[PDB]
Design an enzyme around this catalytic site. Sequence first.
Site, PDB file in Angstrom:
ATOM      1  N   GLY A  24       0.827  -1.184   0.000  1.00 39.66           N
ATOM      2  CA  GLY A  24       0.000   0.000   0.000  1.00 39.66           C
ATOM      3  C   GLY A  24       0.870   1.245   0.000  1.00 39.66           C
ATOM      4  O   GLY A  24       2.108   1.148  -0.027  1.00 39.66           O
ATOM      5  N   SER A  25       0.261   2.438   0.021  1.00 42.82           N
ATOM      6  CA  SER A  25       1.081   3.620  -0.214  1.00 42.82           C
ATOM      7  C   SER A  25       2.042   3.901   0.942  1.00 42.82           C
ATOM      8  O   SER A  25       3.175   4.334   0.690  1.00 42.82           O
ATOM      9  CB  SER A  25       0.220   4.824  -0.538  1.00 42.82           C
ATOM     10  OG  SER A  25      -0.794   4.963   0.433  1.00 42.82           O
ATOM     11  N   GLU A  27       3.737   1.934   2.421  1.00 41.19           N
ATOM     12  CA  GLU A  27       4.775   0.933   2.326  1.00 41.19           C
ATOM     13  C   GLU A  27       5.682   1.177   1.111  1.00 41.19           C
ATOM     14  O   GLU A  27       6.752   0.593   1.017  1.00 41.19           O
ATOM     15  CB  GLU A  27       4.140  -0.454   2.307  1.00 41.19           C
ATOM     16  CG  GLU A  27       3.391  -0.775   3.641  1.00 41.19           C
ATOM     17  CD  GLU A  27       2.051  -0.053   3.779  1.00 41.19           C
ATOM     18  OE1 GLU A  27       1.354   0.145   2.756  1.00 41.19           O
ATOM     19  OE2 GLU A  27       1.634   0.289   4.913  1.00 41.19           O
ATOM     20  N   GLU A  46      -4.621  -9.987   3.120  1.00 40.34           N
ATOM     21  CA  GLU A  46      -3.620 -10.085   4.180  1.00 40.34           C
ATOM     22  C   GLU A  46      -3.710 -11.362   5.016  1.00 40.34           C
ATOM     23  O   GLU A  46      -2.687 -11.814   5.528  1.00 40.34           O
ATOM     24  CB  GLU A  46      -3.645  -8.834   5.049  1.00 40.34           C
ATOM     25  CG  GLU A  46      -3.256  -7.576   4.296  1.00 40.34           C
ATOM     26  CD  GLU A  46      -4.370  -6.910   3.511  1.00 40.34           C
ATOM     27  OE1 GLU A  46      -5.514  -7.418   3.413  1.00 40.34           O
ATOM     28  OE2 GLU A  46      -4.059  -5.832   2.970  1.00 40.34           O
ATOM     29  N   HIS A  69      -0.317  -3.198   4.957  1.00 41.46           N
ATOM     30  CA  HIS A  69      -0.706  -1.818   4.796  1.00 41.46           C
ATOM     31  C   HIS A  69      -1.529  -1.304   5.987  1.00 41.46           C
ATOM     32  O   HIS A  69      -2.727  -1.594   6.109  1.00 41.46           O
ATOM     33  CB  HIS A  69      -1.520  -1.643   3.504  1.00 41.46           C
ATOM     34  CG  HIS A  69      -1.948  -0.235   3.288  1.00 41.46           C
ATOM     35  ND1 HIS A  69      -1.058   0.817   3.268  1.00 41.46           N
ATOM     36  CD2 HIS A  69      -3.171   0.299   3.109  1.00 41.46           C
ATOM     37  CE1 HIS A  69      -1.719   1.943   3.073  1.00 41.46           C
ATOM     38  NE2 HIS A  69      -3.004   1.657   2.989  1.00 41.46           N
ATOM     39  N   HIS A 280     -10.828 -29.020  24.142  1.00 39.28           N
ATOM     40  CA  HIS A 280     -11.741 -28.341  23.237  1.00 39.28           C
ATOM     41  C   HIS A 280     -13.178 -28.533  23.718  1.00 39.28           C
ATOM     42  O   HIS A 280     -13.770 -27.618  24.297  1.00 39.28           O
ATOM     43  CB  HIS A 280     -11.478 -28.901  21.847  1.00 39.28           C
ATOM     44  CG  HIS A 280     -12.331 -28.338  20.777  1.00 39.28           C
ATOM     45  ND1 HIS A 280     -13.232 -27.324  20.981  1.00 39.28           N
ATOM     46  CD2 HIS A 280     -12.423 -28.671  19.470  1.00 39.28           C
ATOM     47  CE1 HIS A 280     -13.851 -27.056  19.848  1.00 39.28           C
ATOM     48  NE2 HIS A 280     -13.373 -27.854  18.918  1.00 39.28           N
ATOM     49  N   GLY A 400      -7.502 -22.996  15.759  1.00 36.91           N
ATOM     50  CA  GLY A 400      -8.779 -23.438  15.239  1.00 36.91           C
ATOM     51  C   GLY A 400      -9.352 -22.509  14.187  1.00 36.91           C
ATOM     52  O   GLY A 400     -10.499 -22.689  13.788  1.00 36.91           O
TER      53      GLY A 400
HETATM   54  C1  LIG Z   1     -12.140 -18.136  10.976  1.00 40.76           C
HETATM   55  C2  LIG Z   1     -13.162 -19.154  11.446  1.00 40.76           C
HETATM   56  N1  LIG Z   1     -14.503 -18.881  11.353  1.00 40.76           N
HETATM   57  C3  LIG Z   1     -15.422 -19.778  11.791  1.00 40.76           C
HETATM   58  C4  LIG Z   1     -14.999 -20.943  12.340  1.00 40.76           C
HETATM   59  C5  LIG Z   1     -15.957 -21.951  12.896  1.00 40.76           C
HETATM   60  N2  LIG Z   1     -15.844 -23.258  12.298  1.00 40.76           N
HETATM   61  C6  LIG Z   1     -16.411 -23.677  10.985  1.00 40.76           C
HETATM   62  C7  LIG Z   1     -17.236 -22.712  10.189  1.00 40.76           C
HETATM   63  C8  LIG Z   1     -16.077 -25.123  10.758  1.00 40.76           C
HETATM   64  C9  LIG Z   1     -16.630 -25.770   9.565  1.00 40.76           C
HETATM   65  C10 LIG Z   1     -15.592 -26.187   8.572  1.00 40.76           C
HETATM   66  O1  LIG Z   1     -16.255 -26.733   7.509  1.00 40.76           O
HETATM   67  P1  LIG Z   1     -15.394 -27.568   6.504  1.00 40.76           P
HETATM   68  O2  LIG Z   1     -16.230 -27.711   5.287  1.00 40.76           O
HETATM   69  O3  LIG Z   1     -14.117 -26.955   6.239  1.00 40.76           O
HETATM   70  O4  LIG Z   1     -15.133 -28.970   7.178  1.00 40.76           O
HETATM   71  P2  LIG Z   1     -16.122 -30.093   7.781  1.00 40.76           P
HETATM   72  O5  LIG Z   1     -17.318 -30.210   6.886  1.00 40.76           O
HETATM   73  O6  LIG Z   1     -15.261 -31.366   7.761  1.00 40.76           O
HETATM   74  O7  LIG Z   1     -16.498 -29.656   9.174  1.00 40.76           O
HETATM   75  S1  LIG Z   1     -15.141 -25.793  11.981  1.00 40.76           S
HETATM   76  C11 LIG Z   1     -15.062 -24.417  12.936  1.00 40.76           C
HETATM   77  O8  LIG Z   1     -14.459 -24.334  14.046  1.00 40.76           O
HETATM   78  C12 LIG Z   1     -13.646 -21.188  12.452  1.00 40.76           C
HETATM   79  N3  LIG Z   1     -13.110 -22.323  13.085  1.00 40.76           N
HETATM   80  N4  LIG Z   1     -12.723 -20.304  11.994  1.00 40.76           N
HETATM   81  C1  LIG Z   2      -6.923  -3.982   2.917  1.00 41.01           C
HETATM   82  C2  LIG Z   2      -6.014  -3.168   2.015  1.00 41.01           C
HETATM   83  N1  LIG Z   2      -4.801  -3.671   1.621  1.00 41.01           N
HETATM   84  C3  LIG Z   2      -3.973  -2.940   0.832  1.00 41.01           C
HETATM   85  C4  LIG Z   2      -4.352  -1.697   0.451  1.00 41.01           C
HETATM   86  C5  LIG Z   2      -3.464  -0.814  -0.371  1.00 41.01           C
HETATM   87  N2  LIG Z   2      -4.057  -0.375  -1.608  1.00 41.01           N
HETATM   88  C6  LIG Z   2      -4.162  -1.171  -2.864  1.00 41.01           C
HETATM   89  C7  LIG Z   2      -3.563  -2.543  -2.928  1.00 41.01           C
HETATM   90  C8  LIG Z   2      -4.831  -0.328  -3.912  1.00 41.01           C
HETATM   91  C9  LIG Z   2      -4.943  -0.884  -5.263  1.00 41.01           C
HETATM   92  C10 LIG Z   2      -6.353  -1.139  -5.692  1.00 41.01           C
HETATM   93  O1  LIG Z   2      -6.296  -1.687  -6.942  1.00 41.01           O
HETATM   94  P1  LIG Z   2      -7.632  -1.712  -7.755  1.00 41.01           P
HETATM   95  O2  LIG Z   2      -7.406  -2.669  -8.866  1.00 41.01           O
HETATM   96  O3  LIG Z   2      -8.764  -2.061  -6.935  1.00 41.01           O
HETATM   97  O4  LIG Z   2      -7.861  -0.252  -8.306  1.00 41.01           O
HETATM   98  P2  LIG Z   2      -6.948   0.734  -9.199  1.00 41.01           P
HETATM   99  O5  LIG Z   2      -6.264  -0.074 -10.259  1.00 41.01           O
HETATM  100  O6  LIG Z   2      -7.971   1.717  -9.793  1.00 41.01           O
HETATM  101  O7  LIG Z   2      -5.964   1.397  -8.268  1.00 41.01           O
HETATM  102  S1  LIG Z   2      -5.299   1.185  -3.353  1.00 41.01           S
HETATM  103  C11 LIG Z   2      -4.720   0.999  -1.790  1.00 41.01           C
HETATM  104  O8  LIG Z   2      -4.793   1.874  -0.877  1.00 41.01           O
HETATM  105  C12 LIG Z   2      -5.564  -1.195   0.881  1.00 41.01           C
HETATM  106  N3  LIG Z   2      -6.003   0.113   0.614  1.00 41.01           N
HETATM  107  N4  LIG Z   2      -6.405  -1.931   1.652  1.00 41.01           N
END
Ligand SMILES: Cc1ncc(Cn2c(C)c(CCOP(=O)(O)OP(=O)(O)O)sc2=O)c(N)n1
Ligand SMILES: Cc1ncc(Cn2c(C)c(CCOP(=O)(O)OP(=O)(O)O)sc2=O)c(N)n1
Lengths: 525, 525, 525
Positions: A24-25, A27, A46, A69, A280, A400
């Site tokens: 990002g800018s 950086e 990210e 960023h 767990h 997890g």
């Molecule tokens: C970032 C995030 N969001 C939500 C969950 C909650 N969560 C979720 C949504 C699971 C389901 C995963 O589904 P899957 O399709 O990857 O696998 P299974 O069908 O084998 O459970 S397991 C679990 O702890 C999580 N662990 N992490």
């Molecule tokens: C979450 C996140 N990560 C990184 C950036 C840094 N960043 C990035 C990576 C931009 C580029 C966007 O590209 P785009 O294709 O969406 O649009 P343009 O080509 O018109 O710039 S603008 C900007 O501030 C951001 N703003 N937000």
Amino acid sequence: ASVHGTTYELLRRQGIDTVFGNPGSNELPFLKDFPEDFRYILALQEACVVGIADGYAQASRKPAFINLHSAAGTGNAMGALSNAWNSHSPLIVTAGQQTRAMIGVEALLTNVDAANLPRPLVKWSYEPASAAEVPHAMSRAIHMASMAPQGPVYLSVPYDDWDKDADPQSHHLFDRHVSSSVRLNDQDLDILVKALNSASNPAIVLGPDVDAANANADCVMLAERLKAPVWVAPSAPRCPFPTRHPCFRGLMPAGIAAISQLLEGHDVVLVIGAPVFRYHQYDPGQYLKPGTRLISVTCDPLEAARAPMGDAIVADIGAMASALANLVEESSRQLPTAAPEPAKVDQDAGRLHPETVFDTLNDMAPENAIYLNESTSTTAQMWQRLNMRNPGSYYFCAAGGSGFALPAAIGVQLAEPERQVIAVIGDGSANYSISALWTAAQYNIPTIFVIMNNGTYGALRWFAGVLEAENVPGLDVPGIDFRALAKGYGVQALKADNLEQLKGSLQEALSAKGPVLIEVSTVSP
Amino acid sequence: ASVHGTTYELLRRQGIDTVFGNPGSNELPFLKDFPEDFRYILALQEACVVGIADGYAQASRKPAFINLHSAAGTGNAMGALSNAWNSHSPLIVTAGQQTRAMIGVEALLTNVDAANLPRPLVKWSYEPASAAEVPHAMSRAIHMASMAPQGPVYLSVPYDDWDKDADPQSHHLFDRHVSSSVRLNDQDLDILVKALNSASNPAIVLGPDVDAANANADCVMLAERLKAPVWVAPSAPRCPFPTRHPCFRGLMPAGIAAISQLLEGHDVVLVIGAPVFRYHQYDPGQYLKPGTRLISVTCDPLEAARAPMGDAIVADIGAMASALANLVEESSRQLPTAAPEPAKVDQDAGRLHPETVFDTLNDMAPENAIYLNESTSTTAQMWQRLNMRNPGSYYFCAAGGSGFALPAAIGVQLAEPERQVIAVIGDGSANYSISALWTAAQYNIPTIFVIMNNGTYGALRWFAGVLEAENVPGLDVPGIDFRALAKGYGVQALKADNLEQLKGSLQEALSAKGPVLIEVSTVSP
Amino acid sequence: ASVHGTTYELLRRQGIDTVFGNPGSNELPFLKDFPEDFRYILALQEACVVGIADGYAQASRKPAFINLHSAAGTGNAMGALSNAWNSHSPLIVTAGQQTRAMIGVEALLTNVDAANLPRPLVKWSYEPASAAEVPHAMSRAIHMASMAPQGPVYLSVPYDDWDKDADPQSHHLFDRHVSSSVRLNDQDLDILVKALNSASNPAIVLGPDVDAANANADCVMLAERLKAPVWVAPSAPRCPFPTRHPCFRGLMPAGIAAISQLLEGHDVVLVIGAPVFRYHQYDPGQYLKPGTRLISVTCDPLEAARAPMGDAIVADIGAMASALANLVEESSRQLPTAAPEPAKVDQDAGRLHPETVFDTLNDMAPENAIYLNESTSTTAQMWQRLNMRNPGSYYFCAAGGSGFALPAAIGVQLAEPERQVIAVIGDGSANYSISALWTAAQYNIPTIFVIMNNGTYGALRWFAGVLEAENVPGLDVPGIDFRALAKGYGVQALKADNLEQLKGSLQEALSAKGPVLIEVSTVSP
Ligand SMILES: Cc1ncc(Cn2c(C)c(CCOP(=O)(O)OP(=O)(O)O)sc2=O)c(N)n1
Ligand SMILES: Cc1ncc(Cn2c(C)c(CCOP(=O)(O)OP(=O)(O)O)sc2=O)c(N)n1
Ligand SMILES: Cc1ncc(Cn2c(C)c(CCOP(=O)(O)OP(=O)(O)O)sc2=O)c(N)n1
Ligand SMILES: [Ca+2]
Ligand SMILES: [Ca+2]
Ligand SMILES: [Ca+2]
Ligand SMILES: [Ca+2]
Ligand SMILES: [Ca+2]
Ligand SMILES: [Ca+2]
Ligand code: NA
């Protein structure tokens, strides 16, 4: 010298040569004039950047360097940081800040109260008070990430700092060597060794810090000398032991009562490199049964403090495992007998049972494959069915949090270019960090992604049946075409609706010259 | 009554009827027995959940309720929370915690030091000390999110709390009415009105809190009475004024010197509902030129405190805009003349200039369309080329964090089912929250997504050219097939490689009965 | 069992038998039924409570337990916690919270966001999620305070928790043994020993963690074997070496250039148990001169990370000092020659020069006296003039915060009932914690307090002359009668206006059966 030149010199002198980033800018003044001896690995979001870096750090057993960023970029990575905290991953997270002249007005892209943003998921978090301090702050970040217990750290740098003059005394930072490779003093280590030698029925439990330390072979020697069964501590982020060795007894169930029952009759239980314990499910009962005492060796004071039972020693896992393995007596007890092979589950010509998928992977994959698991309802079967002989063969999201395995598998494959990485990821989990696929395509990192498609969040549905919880919304994820997502990001894609197609797809994937995604139709739970 | 029953009663009595979520096990005891009068909107990753809820809250002008999974789920949403903080979005973020009996041991899925995790991006963050306190804590969350200055809040709830008995005195929470609809006292308001009436050449600057307050029509009346030009404060998250009204002068450049030059010769500048100012580029100079004084009306003490110049009044924007519009004299000065129409840029039969895309959208879209912008290099052209007559017609990521517009456009379309939402998103930005597309497909929310595909992070490349920064890595994003990503998530997809195809695709999208993604080949910067 | 009974059992089983406190209502349910085997030491203000406990912990070399009242009591102690953080003092700070049923409404005496209050001056800070968790949280507090690097911790407990039923599994906490007594692995320790054996002109620098570890005698052996000069690291909180031993070279000046000049010509400088370095004045220059390399052994990762030069080893100071002392070769170099005695400063029959006071104390005090220093302008002279042969003979506020020595001298005297404690405190510093005198009177703890009365904040006036800073207010403190303050709190008081009276007063104080304060008229700077 500039702050920019001095900081890259410090990084290279400390062994860092790769930047994982999404730019990002704030950086741009850091990334400009990027050194020719460094590599930049771009990812599109990210969580993906940090996941890739995390897999790279865990497999390489060295720190990985990340550039994000400001607040929004840091914030998008904080679920990934929750996993990295639990896996003790040595990650140096840097984020660009606004120029010092507009921080006060809170210009767009100012990271307000920056050091507090990633807390409590970092070991150290800091923004320097001046440009000349930046190399010293980077030095602190490198060492804080790298000292036991390893973990993620955060450094915020105002973009105007990079072009300023460095302090000429910063050269003293470049070659600092900082060690935490320590072990219990001789007298107390002799006491521990005598307790192990004297035990009538010892058991060993190993956690992820064993694999991080590459202490696996020493733990094999230790278990062979003590003639002791070996488990893996619950909710395992890594595999610390060869899974077909005769002493191996598998993954412990993540429940209080289940573990004390499992350990009943063992007089001394030695835990190495694990929290005590990452339970767990709520399975109340005794922490240990009468007759069992526990001794934990951990690299992390926070683990030693919170264990509800047992003695503890806070020390380096590599140094302690080596010392114990070489000091204990060879017991005259009989070596434990290997666990029997798992049974083949009946499989028709339709959708795949997960057991079939793991048996087929075990049949076809090279013996030095590396697996990642984010197929949350099939973990027990995975651990029973994959023969993992070598260190660094298994990763699972340590806190997890889904979204780890897909990007981490790319970082692990980058770290281990001669070991085939196979990520086994549920259809639910695959979405969290789906854009990471693009990095594998762009850099031609030949990870294989096996998507277990059963249409639902199966582990959650199971737990809802377990509570007799009716009318829970949000458990089904129909209508995702993973071959189209792969095509979207430039990765070759295959589908396996039955066993014949699974074998054909795996044969095609194992011989491919780039990353491959296989969508597997698995049986609904 | 249980804590579960009492909490859902409080939510419904306070006007909340929708839960935006991605579920996990700590959340199952909350989501079980989900009330029949509530809706659950699933998204596949937490940045998407929060983005959808944020668009819904901003367009509805009321709080939105979110449920996320512990630390990893909260952490995945923190980039979205950075935008919500800057847009003053009233979001009630709840996350499930481990059962109280295993928090101490830090079982898997424990959210450690939970209230500190989303800081500093929330107004209030809390975990209750007991189950019976949960409804009261929820009441606090609702009111903290909703009082001026609105913003996101966070509540962590141990999963075992929901089935416990509620305090019978919690019924007093259900119908609490809390108002922050306040305006400056009569004497000081009369002083302000006299200053406006007396100004020889006033100017008005409006920010996003005008549109949040639906104060737009009152600001039109105010500008007509004062016969004053109207800008939009820089880095604008919303559109607070009809963009073809004769007083309108466009989006201010986000630079200190540029703004003071723009305001030169204006004796009194009245800023309503904006920070003073959300600068971006570093453009040093005078904050105001001699002869200009500034008066800011803001709903946020933090904005009033950090303004580097001017007087300030901290009050409700709706109440103040209405009072000023109805109290000022009609000036005998001539009404400002409307800005001329933008020129047509030359366009061949190849890749589209962004100007062409915006002109064509303006030609074809309904007059009550709602636009979202995450096409970061084309913002100026967008503001010049779209006639936005109505309130609630424009959203842009308030903290600059990409990943907002794609999910937010789904939430806005849910809030405004009779207004066609058109999200204009760069190819770079589209990836951050790509999985949000699935929610639009599953719930048939008919958002149109226009992907501006120029192959690069164009705004970043521009700024790197601006610094003469050579050898910056990570600026190009080749090799993404957005029609395949759309197919992956079940959304109809079209491609436009030239103007004829753009017109055809827009005609097809505007008549579709569901969400549509159009990938537009735009000219490389 | 109740939480109350279980917690006191845990405390006694972990060696804790004294509570230092100032009580309040949230603490009454903890203090009721106070066990007959415990002692309670009351002090009248919380800076005093913590200072007393801190001196007790540092002299006893074991954790001290503190009980304070909610936020106001905790807050009154935070300057004392700043010193305890810098001295690595193992302090378990508990504070009572409101009953869980009124925390939400923020009743009077609610400690809001309690765990954040003492941050960043504690290693661990926590409020338990339920009453049954309290013993486990206390166990965590005990071990976190006690593990290397030792330091203060904080636990907030709602008052209603104490009478609740404890978890029967809490018995597993009672006898946990947690060790951090670790040293560098054999291979790398052999490398270090060879580097020391090979050095042509080694120097040794010792810090406070040597004295905390009782590693003093091992460091004497090490210095004798290496035939090396020994300094004390700057801003010294403790004395780690016999000050008349032939190797001793005194307290290092707290300046960058001064230290590198002092070390010039020494090829290897071994620092043990100190930060590198606690500089104070800004004295810019080289961190080390060419030809000098530095190796630091520290118990604290934060010290190792922030050193601007040198290698570092993070390990237990006791274990490392013992190992090094027993492994290095006896060098054939000549043993360093002892520093000459300090000169006698000319002294007339009027006000006392500080040099005279220290010479007279050295003449009259027992050889096993313990000194505390809070006479900020006389530190150099104190270090030159007191022969301190034994460990645990010197304490100085480790963070520079006045208010430490007066209460800490009472805690040290409680810890060491057979060693006469003599606190030498300036007239300015004496006021910060003046009420601590009452505790010495009430419990008949026979500390001697020597108040150096020169009428001013002398160290500050000196530094203001050093900056040519004119017109600084607030530097003089006339008009304090310390004998009347002592009488106010029940302590015998004497005055010494000249040398004859100083000798008479010290003779009377050294033979007294209780605490004594001597007000000494010293020469104005
Ligand atoms: C970032 C995030 N969001 C939500 C969950 C909650 N969560 C979720 C949504 C699971 C389901 C995963 O589904 P899957 O399709 O990857 O696998 P299974 O069908 O084998 O459970 S397991 C679990 O702890 C999580 N662990 N992490
Ligand atoms: C979450 C996140 N990560 C990184 C950036 C840094 N960043 C990035 C990576 C931009 C580029 C966007 O590209 P785009 O294709 O969406 O649009 P343009 O080509 O018109 O710039 S603008 C900007 O501030 C951001 N703003 N937000
Ligand atoms: C809690 C606190 N407040 C203020 C100070 C500032 N300060 C002060 C006020 C000093 C003067 C001490 O005066 P004294 O009478 O104790 O000793 P001298 O006259 O020998 O300096 S030294 C110093 O650092 C401090 N160190 N600690
Ligand atoms: Ca190269
Ligand atoms: Ca699934
Ligand atoms: Ca319904
Ligand atoms: Ca682009
Ligand atoms: Ca007694
Ligand atoms: Ca003085
Ligand atoms: Na945070």
